[PDB]
Design an enzyme around this catalytic site. Structure first.
Site, mmCIF file in Angstrom:
data_model
loop_
_atom_site.group_PDB
_atom_site.id
_atom_site.type_symbol
_atom_site.label_atom_id
_atom_site.label_comp_id
_atom_site.label_asym_id
_atom_site.label_seq_id
_atom_site.Cartn_x
_atom_site.Cartn_y
_atom_site.Cartn_z
ATOM 1 N N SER A 1 14.080 2.654 -0.650
ATOM 2 C CA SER A 1 14.212 4.108 -0.604
ATOM 3 C C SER A 1 15.669 4.480 -0.827
ATOM 4 O O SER A 1 16.591 3.748 -0.429
ATOM 5 C CB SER A 1 13.722 4.669 0.741
ATOM 6 O OG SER A 1 14.081 6.024 0.918
ATOM 7 N N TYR B 1 13.704 5.480 9.869
ATOM 8 C CA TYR B 1 13.221 5.112 8.554
ATOM 9 C C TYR B 1 14.311 4.416 7.717
ATOM 10 O O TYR B 1 14.043 3.409 7.043
ATOM 11 C CB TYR B 1 12.701 6.372 7.881
ATOM 12 C CG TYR B 1 12.248 6.111 6.473
ATOM 13 C CD1 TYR B 1 10.962 5.559 6.209
ATOM 14 C CD2 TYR B 1 13.055 6.435 5.409
ATOM 15 C CE1 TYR B 1 10.519 5.327 4.892
ATOM 16 C CE2 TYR B 1 12.647 6.217 4.126
ATOM 17 C CZ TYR B 1 11.385 5.676 3.843
ATOM 18 O OH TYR B 1 11.017 5.518 2.513
HETATM 19 N N1 NDP Z 1 7.528 8.974 -2.698
HETATM 20 C C1 NDP Z 1 8.853 9.159 -2.266
HETATM 21 O O1 NDP Z 1 9.372 10.269 -2.529
HETATM 22 C C2 NDP Z 1 9.574 7.973 -1.581
HETATM 23 C C3 NDP Z 1 8.846 6.789 -1.367
HETATM 24 N N2 NDP Z 1 9.447 5.635 -0.807
HETATM 25 C C4 NDP Z 1 8.663 4.413 -0.594
HETATM 26 O O2 NDP Z 1 7.780 4.234 -1.705
HETATM 27 C C5 NDP Z 1 6.559 3.573 -1.195
HETATM 28 C C6 NDP Z 1 5.336 4.465 -1.371
HETATM 29 O O3 NDP Z 1 5.712 5.794 -1.259
HETATM 30 P P1 NDP Z 1 4.208 6.823 -1.442
HETATM 31 O O4 NDP Z 1 3.593 6.313 -2.687
HETATM 32 O O5 NDP Z 1 4.810 8.213 -1.392
HETATM 33 O O6 NDP Z 1 3.353 6.452 -0.088
HETATM 34 P P2 NDP Z 1 1.763 7.107 0.013
HETATM 35 O O7 NDP Z 1 1.699 7.405 1.480
HETATM 36 O O8 NDP Z 1 1.505 8.182 -1.019
HETATM 37 O O9 NDP Z 1 0.713 5.878 -0.340
HETATM 38 C C7 NDP Z 1 0.738 5.037 0.757
HETATM 39 C C8 NDP Z 1 0.008 3.766 0.364
HETATM 40 O O10 NDP Z 1 0.372 2.765 1.314
HETATM 41 C C9 NDP Z 1 -0.861 2.319 1.929
HETATM 42 N N3 NDP Z 1 -0.563 1.984 3.341
HETATM 43 C C10 NDP Z 1 0.182 2.683 4.307
HETATM 44 N N4 NDP Z 1 0.264 2.047 5.499
HETATM 45 C C11 NDP Z 1 -0.461 0.866 5.285
HETATM 46 C C12 NDP Z 1 -0.782 -0.239 6.123
HETATM 47 N N5 NDP Z 1 -0.356 -0.316 7.438
HETATM 48 N N6 NDP Z 1 -1.527 -1.278 5.631
HETATM 49 C C13 NDP Z 1 -1.953 -1.190 4.316
HETATM 50 N N7 NDP Z 1 -1.751 -0.225 3.407
HETATM 51 C C14 NDP Z 1 -0.975 0.812 3.925
HETATM 52 C C15 NDP Z 1 -2.001 3.461 1.746
HETATM 53 O O11 NDP Z 1 -3.231 2.898 1.770
HETATM 54 P P3 NDP Z 1 -4.538 4.075 2.294
HETATM 55 O O12 NDP Z 1 -4.589 4.701 0.930
HETATM 56 O O13 NDP Z 1 -5.685 3.154 2.731
HETATM 57 O O14 NDP Z 1 -3.801 4.825 3.364
HETATM 58 C C16 NDP Z 1 -1.604 4.004 0.371
HETATM 59 O O15 NDP Z 1 -2.269 3.225 -0.593
HETATM 60 C C17 NDP Z 1 6.762 3.357 0.359
HETATM 61 O O16 NDP Z 1 7.380 2.127 0.604
HETATM 62 C C18 NDP Z 1 7.665 4.564 0.639
HETATM 63 O O17 NDP Z 1 8.356 4.506 1.849
HETATM 64 C C19 NDP Z 1 10.844 5.625 -0.528
HETATM 65 C C20 NDP Z 1 11.621 6.735 -0.696
HETATM 66 C C21 NDP Z 1 11.066 8.061 -1.179
#
Ligand code: NDP
Ligand code: NDP
Ligand code: NDP
Ligand code: NDP
Lengths: 247, 247, 247, 247
Positions: free
Chosen positions: B142, B156
């Protein structure tokens, strides 16, 4: 391909990393202009242009000493007149003068700073005036900009870290037009400036995460990525292609 | 097909950035296994698998809570037996819990560290035993790992900057096998977790170099580049895809 | 006596770098509370309290296993009852577990993350509510947080780079009260955990800019500078006291 | 008096940060030589010299335009003869030229790079020849070297990030003699070049962790720390005194 209809300007395109960059961008479909300085590179350069035209690309070889700011500005202006405004500017030409700190001369200082710092800045100033929205600026830096690691590279290291702030300032200056500015940092790359079989090559490999020199395509590919559709949201970044030299 | 014959493993592949990565790596020719956690995502996840099979790729969706170390380890073990040793491991699943420092609970902490730090580390440990030479590890970090920028993201940001040392150390651990380890840092990306039209979105766009959110393909394109042949000499690096948030 | 009337909390103040911090901060006039873990350290710790009181300083020794979050929280609370709200919090106690990546156990991970990451966050969370305006938080990191440099330190490096994001988020969370938060990075320092004469010690000196290990007073002096009047405008910074390891 | 018996050299010592450095290093007991450029500063410079002599320190003020390499070298040579070899060299004089990228002139470029980069390098080359073992080099950089944050500071940010690589290489070049080399990065500091009440000041305080400009003593204190016994193991480092601008 993804560079079809685009114009690229590459300083130092006659050989080494710059020749690898011009070949890669032309294969992606860019029309290419590139510079060289040495009289011994004239034959290589016109052969390179002939190789690109034979693939159906427009290409120009322009002799322009990066030591001379007026020559870099003129080269870009000539490139714009013959191929049109430049979409991708790659500042690659560089010089490496290393050695004991007390032996550095003012000519070492002015020459390093004019070639490694001022020329990229002048090419950008000439190119940016008419660069189409969504344009790209890609500076070739060095892993020594972020970590010197050894004695003897102070002046080179300062010229290359000057590009960090220049690139970050450019990403702010030009982002409203969608133009991106990044600097790529090679680790050891097998070229004439740094042969993989040089007597010093072995102690250098010893400190890498991957135990070998990289190759010129490693740099060209990072540049091709920043130049293309996948680079549109990357900007202001330092991208190391260094074999884990910094890890 | 730059990834033809390779196996890729992706946590959190059912939606957002993780879904765009699975589509991109399969489209580049990798067989794909990926995880999801909520039962509400079971339909979306199995639809995604048929979409890849209908394009001729093998793909498997595995329910595995990143909070639980055994579920992630078992998920990787299942993919190795069903698809073969994984070439590309993408630690993407993550959680963002923000708020005042004094309101942070132990469950917020254990849940953040278990998911953002421990789950990737466990997945890497299971995958690395049999990863073929030349493999790729890619952590999704991030921009907040490198610059917090605002109040309310301390927990975070700690969990994401934890991937920095982990990635650099992995690059050293695995570099003799040709395996690379990198962290990609998204800037704001239009997803369910971070909608481009959220009430706070405008003040975030205001601090960017490019004046808009990115999109999930922007992270996927960086991941595909590090996964493929052009990533072979990139390792231990931090790669920002942040619209110049950091510039 | 720039610390007169201030209270300091130091985890791990019984020996090594932490003993040097409590000595230096008390010489600057702070009343001091500090923790120890080993029952075998109770003699050294109560001896340290006696040395400080014989100089006219108030001091408390508190046994608190950093692996246990509750013991850290209760140690801070006791120090507060005994000496008043803490002005200067120094998170120093740490653990260094190194070795091949495939031999890391979950006990290694849990113990490293609880001691190096959670315990500091818990102490800060305990001390921050009543920390007087203008207070100081100083985390002891490591040079390996910014550069792994070698194989075998992946888990430790990740635990230590976790303090970068935590410290930058704290500087945002607390700066409106004038509180600063910084992380100090020792380079090799001659202590019990890293003897200067260990068989591996020579290869490490070979990569420093200064050709020798540092000493515990070098960290104590950096901590004293951050704790006192000259540190008042330093916050969110990473400060290397590493002999040029990173240069 | 930890600087007793030592000589310090400070470019730009007549006002702002540089005068506070000369006062702080003299109060710590150094004999001081410092430069100025404007004929208008000649009264201020000689009054400062008398203030130091009235406290019993030796001091000399030398007019030397940093734009001119011979004047910079000459000033260092003159101070070496008059006060003895320099123990503490502080490159402080600087110029800030900001504005749109397309309006940057050849004079803007030449003056910024000659003053912000070349003059420090020349002072270092002159002082290092006879610098006593264990000496200190301290460059004054800027928070804009590491993060530009805004449009219009590209040239300046390039000139300041050049000190990063210069400093790290110097630390390797000189570390065998016990000499350290570091760069201090001020945040906004209330001076003539950056007044605390300027129309732009409020939007700048808005991006800080501490919600106010710093003061010249905050910079003098970090330099004094680096110069003294407590800095002996700090080298090759970037030390931010920026109010958390970067946090
Ligand atoms: N988008 C942004 O603006 C930013 C994003 N990031 C990082 O990018 C990555 C994704 O961001 P984003 O796409 O927005 O996240 P989303 O919340 O949109 O998608 C989350 C995904 O992670 C899965 N997930 C969450 N917790 C678990 C768990 N405990 N076990 C298994 N699967 C899990 C969900 O599965 P289900 O669908 O079953 O919940 C879903 O597929 C993360 O690491 C986030 O922190 C970093 C900085 C900024
Ligand atoms: N290779 C490495 O290991 C590293 C390289 N770099 C950087 O990569 C870039 C080039 O890498 P490399 O290919 O190894 O260098 P090479 O010396 O192998 O090739 C140099 C190229 O730059 C051109 N060039 C040099 N000086 C001038 C000048 N004054 N005016 C115009 N063109 C000039 C040359 O043109 P001609 O053929 O006409 O001389 C030639 O085409 C440089 O910026 C270098 O600093 C960074 C880190 C390490
Ligand atoms: N030494 C070096 O060269 C480097 C040091 N560091 C970091 O500096 C800090 C201290 O280093 P050093 O002083 O050399 O280590 P030492 O083991 O020499 O001293 C450790 C101190 O921390 C305390 N401590 C250790 N583990 C715990 C725990 N679980 N709970 C409570 N107190 C504990 C010990 O207390 P007791 O006497 O009760 O055991 C002792 O007083 C650590 O965080 C380390 O990671 C960073 C980079 C390199
Ligand atoms: N203050 C700030 O907000 C920030 C400052 N910095 C850096 O900190 C340093 C000092 O900051 P500040 O005190 O604000 O600067 P000021 O402009 O307030 O003081 C300028 C000093 O530099 C001297 N000087 C300027 N040009 C020359 C020259 N060509 N040759 C010799 N001496 C010269 C002046 O001498 P005279 O008295 O003869 O004019 C004066 O002593 C600079 O490097 C600046 O860029 C970095 C980040 C922020």
């Amino acid at each position: 391909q993804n560079l079809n209809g685009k114009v690229a300007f590459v300083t130092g395109g006659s050989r080494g990393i710059g020749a690898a960059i011009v070949r890669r961008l032309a294969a992606d479909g860019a029309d290419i202009a590139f510079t060289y300085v040495s009289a011994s590179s004239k034959n290589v350069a016109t052969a390179l242009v002939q190789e690109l035209e034979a693939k159906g690309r427009r290409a120009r070889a322009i002799q322009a000493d990066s030591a001379d700011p007026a020559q870099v500005r003129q080269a870009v202006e000539q490139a714009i007149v013959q191929l049109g405004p430049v979409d991708v500017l790659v500042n690659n030409a560089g010089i490496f003068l290393a050695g004991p700190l007390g032996e550095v001369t003012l000519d070492d200082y002015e020459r390093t700073m004019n070639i490694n710092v001022r020329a990229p800045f002048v090419a950008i100033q000439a190119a940016q005036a008419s660069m189409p929205d969504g344009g790209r600026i890609i500076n070739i830096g060095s892993c020594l900009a972020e970590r010197a690691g050894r004695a003897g590279v102070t002046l080179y290291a300062a010229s290359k870290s000057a590009l960090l702030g220049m690139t970050r300032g450019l990403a702010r200056d030009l982002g409203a037009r969608g133009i991106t500015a990044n600097v790529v940092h090679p680790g050891p790359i097998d070229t004439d400036m740094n042969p993989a079989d040089g007597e010093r090559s072995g102690e250098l490999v010893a400190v890498l995460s991957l135990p070998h020199y990289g190759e010129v395509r490693d740099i060209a590919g990072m540049v091709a990525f920043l130049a293309g559709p996948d680079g549109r949201y990357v900007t202001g970044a330092s991208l190391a292609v260094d074999g884990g030299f910094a890890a």
